[PDB]
Design a protein around this ligand. Structure first.
Ligand SMILES: *[B]([O])([O])[C]([C][C][C]C1=[C][C]=[C][C]=[C]1)[N]C(=O)[C]([C][C][C])[N]C(=O)C1=[C]N=[C][C]=N1
Length: 196
């Protein structure tokens, strides 16, 4: 009951909440050409369009720090679209979902399947709380998500949910974005038998 059953690179699942309940929105990223830029579509609002420019600044900065060999974001002409097409959307609960879509694209490696997230991001990566966590959690469950990432400040809003709703959700309560990265992209933080 969702738009994507398998998120490729550049596609992350987010959570949006309306007065009619929850819903699952998918952030998407792609290339336009083979200084680097950014483009946005999906009837986004003046408040969220700032969350894109913040997540874009942070994702570039995150690349600069952890994998400095990766120039993908500082040079490429990127395009972000959040379907469905004509629905209006405004709000920073898409912040982290965007960062992950940008990194996922800039790495060429998809995100954990069956993962939804929501949370406002700051410029330094602090993950700030968002609203209607009850309806975002419910729409993740009605839509088939097994791993949810909430802002850690939104812990009560999640545990106000009945016993049957939250059971069976791998939920992570995160304060910086580095905690979302280690969950969205697990293989990065995974022990291995270094051979040779
Ligand atoms: B968030 O709660 O701010 C959310 C972000 C929606 C955009 C998005 C979500 C997930 C992935 C990618 C993009 N904003 C909302 O849900 C908006 C409307 C979205 C269509 N609703 C509100 O901001 C709001 C305000 N007051 C009461 C109820 N809703």
């Amino acid at each position: 009951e969702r738009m994507y059953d398998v998120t490729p690179p550049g596609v992350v699942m987010g959570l949006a909440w309306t007065a009619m309940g929850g819903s699952t929105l998918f952030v998407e990223t792609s290339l336009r050409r083979p200084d680097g830029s950014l483009e946005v579509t999906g009837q986004l609002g003046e408040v969220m369009k700032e969350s894109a420019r913040i997540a874009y600044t942070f994702a570039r900065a995150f690349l600069m720090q952890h994998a400095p060999a990766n120039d993908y974001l500082v040079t490429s002409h990127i395009h972000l679209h959040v379907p469905e097409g004509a629905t209006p959307k405004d709000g920073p609960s898409a912040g982290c979902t965007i960062v992950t879509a940008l990194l996922s694209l800039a790495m060429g490696r998809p995100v954990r399947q069956n993962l939804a997230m929501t949370g406002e991001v700051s410029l330094t990566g602090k993950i700030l709380p968002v609203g209607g966590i009850k309806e975002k959690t419910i729409a993740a469950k009605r839509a088939g998500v097994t791993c949810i990432v909430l802002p850690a400040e939104n812990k009560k809003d999640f545990y106000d949910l009945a016993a049957f709703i939250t059971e069976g959700l791998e939920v992570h309560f995160v304060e910086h974005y580095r905690e979302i990265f280690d969950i969205a992209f697990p293989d990065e933080q995974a022990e291995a038998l270094a051979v040779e």
